[PDB]
Amino acid sequence: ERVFQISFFNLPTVHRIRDIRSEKIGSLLSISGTVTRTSEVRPELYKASFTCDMCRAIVDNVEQSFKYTEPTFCPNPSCENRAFWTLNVTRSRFLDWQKVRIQENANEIPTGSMPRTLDVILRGDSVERAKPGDRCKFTGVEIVVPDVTQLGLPGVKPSSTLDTRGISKTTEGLRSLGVRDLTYKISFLACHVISIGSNIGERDQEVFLNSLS
Amino acid sequence: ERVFQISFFNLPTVHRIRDIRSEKIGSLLSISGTVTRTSEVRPELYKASFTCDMCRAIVDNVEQSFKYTEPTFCPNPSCENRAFWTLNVTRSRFLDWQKVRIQENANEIPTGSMPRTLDVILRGDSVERAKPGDRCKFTGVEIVVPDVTQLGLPGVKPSSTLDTRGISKTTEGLRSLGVRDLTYKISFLACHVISIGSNIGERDQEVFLNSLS
Amino acid sequence: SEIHVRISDFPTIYSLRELRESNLSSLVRVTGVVTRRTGVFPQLKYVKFNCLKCGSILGPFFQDSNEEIRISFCTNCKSKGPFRVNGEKTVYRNYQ
Ligand SMILES: [Zn+2]
Ligand SMILES: [Zn+2]
Ligand SMILES: [Zn+2]
């Protein structure tokens, strides 16, 4: 099956990098910025195909959303456990992936502050449409990505522990639980990349005169 | 596939139970004896159907020769080990098996000796043709069966050890070998059973008058 | 006991900047300038083990270049004990 990508453009407003707020996470947005770093094109696990460790039958077309996930269904009835799996990288499907870093435009930086950066990720056909040093308008979705460096930051960092209310227990003997931090940074995932001119306002001549009306 | 059985009968000679010697093991033979005990008809594993433990795939039509055997081939190429298997008793094939004990005929006993018994095994259609208390002529093969009671008997009991001459070893460190005793007793595997008269020389009358000439 | 076949004059020509999702597990012909190279390392090719329980030396097994290979049975003492790779009886290929 061919993967399709929907690219939206001509959004009514264009946001600065510093205008990005947490209320717009998971929402369609258009930002602008100057590209500083471009990574090389890398494969991203889209449709993972797994084999169970002890039943050893192959299953395919597993949804992959950001962090790496393994299925717990195990549809064959031969075995009885869910957690143990092994990835088949040859059989699984991948998409193009690029992490391009963008910086606030020089006219948009506030009075005394330094420019702040943002890692926007391009997937599929949008990859390699941005060059080091040009001004690009990215249309996409404001996403959120796990950050570990917020451990030393002041303030109450949210955390997640397992709720145990409907679980029966006995004090037979022979008390451990899984608690994990909720610390994140805002990132962007663009479906449309257009390069507006770095100015204020292809070697062959034929392709140039074809472009002009 | 049905399980065909070849029964031979009318051999030129019939041997006594004390005429049984080790040099006729694996040979066609006819003996006569008085049946003393008959066992319940039981199933015997004829074609085993096994499942590999970590392949979890089934294999069938495995020959079982006397003692219980497990295949080590595993034509499924998923596994790399041969010893580990499980038996599926429902899918495997069985055959009718009976063990009947026979004793010396009264005239055949020597001068001062007590009668000696032999366990003759009937398979297939020959089961339940031997009844307690009658003189019977068995035709079959002198087979051999493992015996544990010969442990304290005088004489050198033969034993088998692994021959280790072409096996390379290293004294890395961190010497055990498998040895078994080859002690055996003679038994009989009969394909044909006929009940000659317990005398020296069916209630309905029609079935009796039809038999006469 | 090993003959390597080298395919020459592959028609499709790719630059390193245009390798994409479609070229995985496929033959690509790419040009470029070598920046730096590592030393020649021995990679396991015909891997041979020994069992710590009995000291028996197992048969040679081919090492796939994709992943490490491991053995779980001894076939002499019938144990799943810790097997160790001995380098004197293991055969290697060159790696760079
Ligand atoms: Zn499974
Ligand atoms: Zn197997
Ligand atoms: Zn061993």
Side-chain angles (χ1 to χ4, degrees):
Chain A
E1 293 176 351
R2 182 207 294 269
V3 64
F4 279 105
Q5 277 180 211
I6 296 98
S7 294
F8 285 99
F9 65 98
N10 200 359
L11 268 290
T13 61
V14 177
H15 292 204
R16 298 153 46 161
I17 302 299
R18 285 177 184 262
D19 309 346
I20 285 179
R21 304 287 190 250
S22 296
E23 65 183 1
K24 297 296 289 183
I25 286 183
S27 75
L28 195 64
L29 211 62
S30 196
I31 61 172
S32 52
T34 304
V35 178
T36 74
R37 185 179 296 113
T38 46
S39 67
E40 76 272 47
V41 188
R42 292 180 179 91
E44 183 179 1
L45 189 62
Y46 184 37
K47 300 289 94 176
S49 87
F50 286 91
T51 61
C52 196
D53 299 349
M54 65 182 179
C55 60
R56 290 187 188 272
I58 192 177
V59 70
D60 58 336
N61 277 8
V62 178
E63 291 289 328
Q64 293 280 313
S65 160
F66 297 93
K67 298 302 293 295
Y68 163 72
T69 61
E70 314 180 328
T72 58
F73 202 89
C74 201
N76 53 3
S78 55
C79 78
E80 292 292 329
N81 304 325
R82 325 189 171 187
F84 312 102
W85 291 89
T86 300
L87 185 41
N88 189 359
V89 295
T90 306
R91 184 65 60 84
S92 295
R93 264 167 67 79
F94 305 92
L95 321 175
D96 305 302
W97 179 93
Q98 204 182 15
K99 183 152 65 43
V100 298
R101 160 185 284 232
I102 62 163
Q103 184 179 2
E104 205 149 17
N105 305 324
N107 50 69
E108 289 169 14
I109 307 174
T111 187
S113 64
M114 295 296 172
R116 55 174 84 264
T117 63
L118 183 74
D119 283 331
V120 64
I121 280 173
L122 319 183
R123 294 179 66 188
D125 291 331
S126 297
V127 181
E128 303 274 347
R129 293 181 184 271
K131 282 150 55 83
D134 61 12
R135 189 184 291 253
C136 310
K137 169 150 73 183
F138 300 88
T139 304
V141 56
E142 173 176 352
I143 61 162
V144 66
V145 160
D147 189 358
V148 193
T149 62
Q150 317 202 356
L151 188 153
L153 275 182
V156 186
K157 273 79 70 177
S159 186
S160 164
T161 174
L162 185 63
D163 199 3
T164 54
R165 298 171 70 254
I167 296 90
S168 304
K169 289 180 59 182
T170 42
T171 180
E172 183 181 8
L174 181 61
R175 298 294 285 103
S176 179
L177 56 91
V179 65
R180 188 269 299 164
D181 273 305
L182 287 161
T183 53
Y184 293 100
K185 64 182 181 293
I186 287 166
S187 195
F188 212 64
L189 188 153
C191 52
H192 188 250
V193 181
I194 190 167
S195 178
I196 200 167
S198 193
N199 56 6
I200 306 299
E202 299 179 344
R203 185 63 60 87
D204 297 345
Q205 64 179 356
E206 284 87 5
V207 69
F208 179 71
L209 282 71
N210 286 349
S211 196
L212 297 186
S213 164
Chain B
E1 291 178 348
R2 86 189 303 141
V3 180
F4 263 89
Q5 290 148 16
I6 296 93
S7 303
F8 284 96
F9 68 98
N10 176 198
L11 293 178
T13 188
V14 60
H15 292 182
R16 292 183 291 113
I17 187 170
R18 283 186 188 261
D19 292 331
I20 285 170
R21 302 291 185 255
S22 292
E23 61 86 20
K24 297 296 289 183
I25 286 183
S27 78
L28 201 61
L29 190 53
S30 196
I31 59 173
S32 53
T34 289
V35 175
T36 64
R37 275 144 49 170
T38 61
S39 71
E40 157 191 32
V41 193
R42 295 169 184 279
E44 184 204 4
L45 197 64
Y46 169 65
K47 298 291 180 68
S49 88
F50 284 1
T51 60
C52 197
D53 300 348
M54 61 80 71
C55 291
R56 291 191 186 275
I58 195 177
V59 68
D60 58 336
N61 289 310
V62 179
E63 315 309 282
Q64 298 282 315
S65 160
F66 296 96
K67 294 300 294 294
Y68 166 74
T69 73
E70 314 180 329
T72 57
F73 198 88
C74 194
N76 212 39
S78 59
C79 82
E80 292 294 328
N81 309 327
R82 326 189 171 187
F84 310 102
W85 289 89
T86 45
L87 156 64
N88 198 359
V89 298
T90 305
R91 178 70 275 172
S92 298
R93 265 170 85 74
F94 298 92
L95 188 153
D96 298 306
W97 173 97
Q98 202 183 18
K99 196 222 289 183
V100 294
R101 186 179 295 275
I102 60 162
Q103 204 187 73
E104 293 180 353
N105 294 275
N107 50 22
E108 287 164 2
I109 309 167
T111 184
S113 66
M114 302 282 105
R116 50 187 49 177
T117 57
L118 189 75
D119 273 315
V120 61
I121 285 173
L122 320 183
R123 298 212 280 197
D125 289 331
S126 63
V127 182
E128 290 263 35
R129 293 180 181 177
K131 66 183 290 294
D134 67 344
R135 186 180 295 275
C136 285
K137 185 183 286 185
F138 296 85
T139 304
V141 54
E142 183 178 1
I143 59 164
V144 69
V145 162
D147 206 358
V148 189
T149 61
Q150 291 167 37
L151 188 64
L153 276 182
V156 172
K157 276 75 70 177
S159 190
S160 66
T161 46
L162 277 296
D163 200 4
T164 309
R165 298 168 68 254
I167 296 90
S168 304
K169 288 180 58 183
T170 44
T171 180
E172 183 181 8
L174 181 62
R175 298 294 285 103
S176 180
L177 57 91
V179 60
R180 65 183 180 179
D181 282 278
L182 313 177
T183 55
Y184 291 99
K185 87 174 175 297
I186 287 165
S187 196
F188 210 65
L189 183 63
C191 54
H192 185 254
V193 186
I194 190 167
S195 177
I196 205 167
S198 192
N199 52 5
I200 307 299
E202 298 178 344
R203 187 64 60 86
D204 296 345
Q205 65 183 357
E206 308 99 351
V207 76
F208 163 73
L209 277 296
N210 286 352
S211 195
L212 297 185
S213 165
Chain C
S1 294
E2 183 73 25
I3 288 289
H4 298 294
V5 178
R6 320 302 204 178
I7 294 298
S8 277
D9 293 331
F10 205 62
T12 61
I13 289 297
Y14 276 141
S15 71
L16 286 190
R17 76 187 177 276
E18 64 185 1
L19 288 164
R20 293 302 189 262
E21 65 183 1
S22 298
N23 304 119
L24 295 166
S25 298
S26 85
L27 210 67
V28 287
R29 182 141 166 257
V30 292
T31 67
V33 170
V34 173
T35 48
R36 82 292 183 276
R37 54 171 170 185
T38 64
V40 181
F41 299 110
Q43 166 166 117
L44 283 72
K45 181 174 73 175
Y46 301 140
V47 179
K48 184 160 286 186
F49 296 84
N50 59 6
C51 172
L52 287 175
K53 311 293 184 60
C54 55
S56 59
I57 309 164
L58 312 181
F61 317 113
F62 182 76
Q63 172 66 77
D64 291 331
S65 179
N66 304 319
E67 287 293 327
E68 184 86 3
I69 62 169
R70 194 179 170 87
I71 184 167
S72 309
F73 204 49
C74 190
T75 74
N76 197 2
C77 66
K78 303 179 180 180
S79 176
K80 336 172 188 180
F83 315 110
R84 193 183 67 84
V85 192
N86 52 333
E88 190 276 331
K89 293 182 183 293
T90 312
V91 176
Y92 299 85
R93 66 178 64 88
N94 300 315
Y95 176 96
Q96 211 175 31

